[PDB]
Amino acid sequence: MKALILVGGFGTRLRPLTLSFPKPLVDFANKPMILHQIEALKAVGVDEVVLAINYQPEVMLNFLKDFETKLEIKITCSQETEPLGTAGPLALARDKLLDGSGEPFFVLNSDVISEYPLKEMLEFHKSHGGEASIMVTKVDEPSKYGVVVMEESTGRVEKFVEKPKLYVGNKINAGIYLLNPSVLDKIELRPTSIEKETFPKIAAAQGLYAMVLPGFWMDIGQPRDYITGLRLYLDSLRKKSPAKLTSGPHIVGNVLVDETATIGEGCLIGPDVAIGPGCIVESGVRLSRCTVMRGVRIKKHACISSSIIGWHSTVGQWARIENMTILGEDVHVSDEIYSNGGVVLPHKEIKSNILKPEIVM
């Protein structure tokens, strides 16, 4: 069985975290974002996975080469001269998706997280014998999205209604697909948007069906979404496997601690905090609603709330971090420094207070 993952570009809207490592290599809740659905593709026994990137893969070849043996999965890249809309990258990778058996392959977006119930979707496919499958999630705001007007009896879609002034539905696409090999011929050589041109082509044929997502949905297109998207992930973890979240007298809520990370005494961590591996947490700290990446050491008596800590950084003693403060890789915050939303560039020594939201270079 095959699979394809739409990455896109480098992650321009996720800087300064994507200034060095590309978009799919950012550690989200300890693990890089690409590993959250690659291991899910191993739950359905997928051997080969292709990435529809637009930049040069020369920078991430060492990372993808280390995941092929650990996860026992074939990982190959495809680079397009230009990203042809939404369905274009699929026309180029059709050669790596056809093994000859004519089995449906999965199409995933890198900007989406969910519970990924991929196993019970094949049975939802091998029951009625449909041709194409997408996943659908309910939203409170259907006007800001493209609404899918399906019937509440079987799951067939009919039309695409973007920005409905009146109520025609609340169900939108979730960015996860399930396509038979019989669809890779309906695309043209011209850049076509799968949401605007290709999907309506199969909806009018009534040869598709839809499934509802019984989980959380989040479109991560900005660095501030990492603290609230980590809530939806850790919440689902309290349901899926509650023993994967650390607990203790200094732990409150849902906290994901790594086996490599070390915590001092007299700290208070939570809720919704994720500490990467190789970190060094000193004593007297107070973490809340933040995420800590690899190798960064936070000194004693620091108070960090709802912020994002880069790789191999250093928070000085008695330093206060709050209000969506975004730090790059290797940023050294002096002691007694206050930051109120400072989006800082990597390789920077902070010796002054960012008392108000400010971009530091």
């Binding site: 300064p16 920077k348 971009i359």
Partner: protein
Amino acid sequence: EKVVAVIMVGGPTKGTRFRPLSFNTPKPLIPLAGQPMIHHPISACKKISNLAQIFLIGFYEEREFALYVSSISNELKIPVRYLKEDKPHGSAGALYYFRDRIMEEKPSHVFLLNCDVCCSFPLQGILDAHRRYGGIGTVIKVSAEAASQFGELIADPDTKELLHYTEKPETFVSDLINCGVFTSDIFNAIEEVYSQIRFVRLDQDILSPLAGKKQLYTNKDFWEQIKTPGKSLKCSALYLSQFRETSPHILASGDGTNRKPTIIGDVYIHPSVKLHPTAKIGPNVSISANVRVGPGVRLISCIILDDVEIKENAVVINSIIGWKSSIGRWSRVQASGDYNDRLGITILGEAVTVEDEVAVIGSIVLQNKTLNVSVQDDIIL
């Protein structure tokens, strides 16, 4: 006699202000008036006939400088060499490190100048003034109101000897300031503070103590400290003015339309550029190699790097366009020109694509960025 020259370079922690440009090219190699920053000090070292080896020191990676140094010695025929101080000790400890390599040819006097300095460089005049003054080592008249930038410096104008020096605590000044040449005895003065007294700053424990002792001595042109990426324009005009006093034929002086655009003085045009006669290239503009200039475009008070694409009817005022950047048609990139304000000079990163009609007024754009909407008074990551 024999003269050696040592230029300070600094590492990636000093060029942390030129960030949009520093990511592609370090601070010392950034083209000022068409040539890299350190390319003007090196050009002044050739006028000393008794000068030989040249030394560039700093904790940068030698891989970046090896390619550049190979091209300088092909022009002026001077032995330039880069040395990476593995243990950076600011300034004084920087040159005491590998003092053997510098004094390898027994030079009588050693030149020491900094990277971020924009003066006239009268190296042959100060060398002979030092030979007459003697002592170990050897200013510019500024207004007394301009004293927060430096501090206090006292020098008796009769012997031109430094009577007193405080780096930052001024406590009354004398209108004179440092600008950034010694004898061979300077290495012994560092041993008496590194070995005898025992991270050593040159202008704190070497310059200040040598006050009453008649060993430290003392422009008549221009000087501008350039640690700011915005200052890269105000100083660029002085170098162009220096290239407009001396040898102007190196400066573009079209002043017409015989397939040559309308050049409005103080313009350096590289021969590898592509131009259109309908463009007006105004004052204080330095164009680099392999750039495609569109028609009817206006270029004043700006510097353009290599591989830039300027489209139909573009306007560039008080700007610094990065490498491989693309300026769309009818798009405008302007700024106030205030060299004191952070956003007074709009700076564009490497391979930034300003789309058609998009306007950028006094803002800083990072490298590899696409702009479909106009921005104003912001810092775009």
